[PDB]
Amino acid sequence: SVGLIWAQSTSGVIGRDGGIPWRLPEDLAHFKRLTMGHTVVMGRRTWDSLPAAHRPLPGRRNVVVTRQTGLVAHGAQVVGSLEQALSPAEPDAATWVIGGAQIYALALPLANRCEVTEVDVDLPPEDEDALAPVLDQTWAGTSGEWLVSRSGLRYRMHSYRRL
């Protein structure tokens, strides 16, 4: 079972300047809860974006997709394609694709679940932004209520599954 998990602004931004352009602690906690103990598959640019105490993501099998065969990624398994990432020698009940924009587009046709955090932050898109994938009519979802973070941002969680 392959799931995608991401956080986006309402406008569809997920990344800017090599990081994430808002602070939402409740969403980081959501991400940690859902992924702990499982495999997390990410693009190389997302691996480079992880802060020191989170690179590798503790308690999870980190898998990094790159075309650079020789890449040094201490604490992670380097593979050369998304399909490789999803064909482990040691199966996992739950595999999560955790970004970024390039990898989400490759993974979406292979996935059966998307766990999306929506962040009510006004972020008009900028030219180098990474953007969220779009879910079409093959996906159907349920939305949690709009919540307010202790830090101030409105947010809510959506759970989609392939029809």
Ligand SMILES: NC(=O)c1ccc[n+]([C@@H]2O[C@H](COP(=O)([O-])OP(=O)(O)OC[C@H]3O[C@@H](n4cnc5c(N)ncnc54)[C@H](OP(=O)(O)O)[C@@H]3O)[C@@H](O)[C@H]2O)c1
């Ligand atoms: N808000 C969220 O939920 C969230 C989650 C994750 C990331 N982000 C943000 O999103 C941004 C990063 O996303 P991104 O789209 O720039 O990059 P990305 O998808 O993390 O990584 C792209 C890299 O993946 C590798 N790759 C892509 N397609 C491949 C293929 N077919 N075969 C093999 N390798 C392939 C390449 O690595 P090589 O160049 O090494 O070959 C490429 O440069 C950052 O801003 C990050 O902070 C946000």
Ligand SMILES: Nc1nc(N)c(OCCCOc2ccccc2CCC(=O)O)c(-c2ccccc2)n1
């Ligand atoms: N919903 C949802 N899906 C995602 N795929 C996602 O990004 C995961 C990759 C970046 O992870 C980061 C980035 C910076 C700091 C810490 C971590 C991992 C910490 C840890 O779990 O140990 C996030 C997210 C995570 C953190 C901040 C904002 C959004 N949120």
